[PDB]
Amino acid sequence: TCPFYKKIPGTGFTVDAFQYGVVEGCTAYFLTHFHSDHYAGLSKHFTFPVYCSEITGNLLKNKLHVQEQYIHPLPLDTECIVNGVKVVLLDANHCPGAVMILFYLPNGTVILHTGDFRADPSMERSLLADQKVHMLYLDTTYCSPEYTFPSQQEVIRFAINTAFEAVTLNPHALVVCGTYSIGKEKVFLAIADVLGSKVGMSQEKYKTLQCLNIPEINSLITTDMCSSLVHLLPMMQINFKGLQSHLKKCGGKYNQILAFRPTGWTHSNKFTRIADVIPQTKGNISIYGIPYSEHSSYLEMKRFVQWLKPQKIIPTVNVGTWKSRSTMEKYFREWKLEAGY
Numbered sequence: 525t526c527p528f529y530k531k532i533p534g535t536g537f538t539v540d541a542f543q544y545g546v547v548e549g550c551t552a553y554f555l556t557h558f559h560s561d562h563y564a565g566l567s568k569h570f571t572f573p574v575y576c577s578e579i580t581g582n583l584l585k586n587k588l589h590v591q592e593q594y595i596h597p598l599p600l601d602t603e604c605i606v607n608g609v610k611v612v613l614l615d616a617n618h619c620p621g622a623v624m625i626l627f628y629l630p631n632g633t634v635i636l637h638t639g640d641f642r643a644d645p646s647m648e649r650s651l652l653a654d655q656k657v658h659m660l661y662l663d664t665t666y667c668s669p670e671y672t673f674p675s676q677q678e679v680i681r682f683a684i685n686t687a688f689e690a691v692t693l694n695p696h697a698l699v700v701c702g703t704y705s706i707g708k709e710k711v712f713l714a715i716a717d718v719l720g721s722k723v724g725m726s727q728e729k730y731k732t733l734q735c736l737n738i739p740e741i742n743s744l745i746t747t748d749m750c751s752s753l754v755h756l757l758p759m760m761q762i763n764f765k766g767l768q769s770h771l772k773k774c775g776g777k778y779n780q781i782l783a784f785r786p787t788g789w790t791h792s793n794k795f796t797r798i799a800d801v802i803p804q805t806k807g808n809i810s811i812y813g814i815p816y817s818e819h820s821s822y823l824e825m826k827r828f829v830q831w832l833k834p835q836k837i838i839p840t841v842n843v844g845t846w847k848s849r850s851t852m853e854k855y856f857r858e859w860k861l862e863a864g865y
């Protein structure tokens with residue numbers, strides 16, 4: 525059944541709750557972003573109102589075939605009335621189209637639901653600065669002090685420098701980047717840009733990218749693989765067997781592959797810096813795992829919450845085990861005692 529942490533009290537609303545059938549008492553289903561664990565259950569047969577961003581709305585229509593009459597896109601940073609309740613959508617700094625949602629309950633309670641987010645100090649100057657938030661439904665993916673990772677900017681700088689050096693030394697090297705969802709487009713776009721190439725990809729993935737309102741996108745991507753020296757493949761194909769295979773397919777146009785696997789966290793983050801990362805190499809194939817995250821580090825999460833000073837925190841991630849739930853509740857109490865709310 526629908527868990528309590530997907531329901532908004534005092535409303536008939538649910539958030540990211542599409543896999544339970546009809547939720548008794550739900551008048552509006554919000555969708556924070558287009559990632560499969562969140563939209564799971566949506567299809568062309570859905571006949572309830574879906575509220576989301578413009579970009580998420582484009583993907584629901586074009587990829588899932590949800591009918592236009594049930595898709596309700598809202599602009600960001602704008603007070604909107606839904607079924608009698610004032611709501612605002614804010615940028616979540618996650619993947620394209622990902623939002624946080626502010627609910628203003630008739631009784632005066634204000635609730636923030638972060639969806640999936642990467643906390644950033646820029647959020648401290650949004651419409652969140654303007655009133656008190658009582659309850660926070662928080663993305664706790666990386667809520668443990670071991671989770672450090674570099675800035676997105678530092679990671680893209682490393683990738684750009686690595687690729688440009690490799691291809692300039694060997695003009696017959698291919699760059700491959702893995703993907704299994706929307707998000708982390710900066711990785712492959714930044715590399716293609718420094719190399720003066722477009723990125724080549726399958727027809728299904730091109731279709732997905734043409735939903736994202738990225739400026740000048742026609743100038744940056746293509747379905748013609750042969751004209752391109754940055755290829756995107758399924759994350760599953762990013763290994764030596766999949767890459768050797770792929771290399772055969774290019775007809776001896778290339779003699780070397782340099783591949784990137786944008787992971788979340790991996791335990792080499794506890795010991796190694798970005799300047800010190802090394803690949804796995806078999807022959808003329810090298811694979812780099814780069815820690816490009818679209819979720820809060822522990823310190824970014826802690827800063828956001830200590831800024832916001834909520835009265836109650838409801839975790840939405842890692843909630844399945846008593847050990848995880850207890851650990852999280854300990855950090856929340858530390859933060860509150862250190863900051864004095």
Ligand code: NI
Nearest residue numbers: 557559618640
């Ligand atoms: Ni996500």
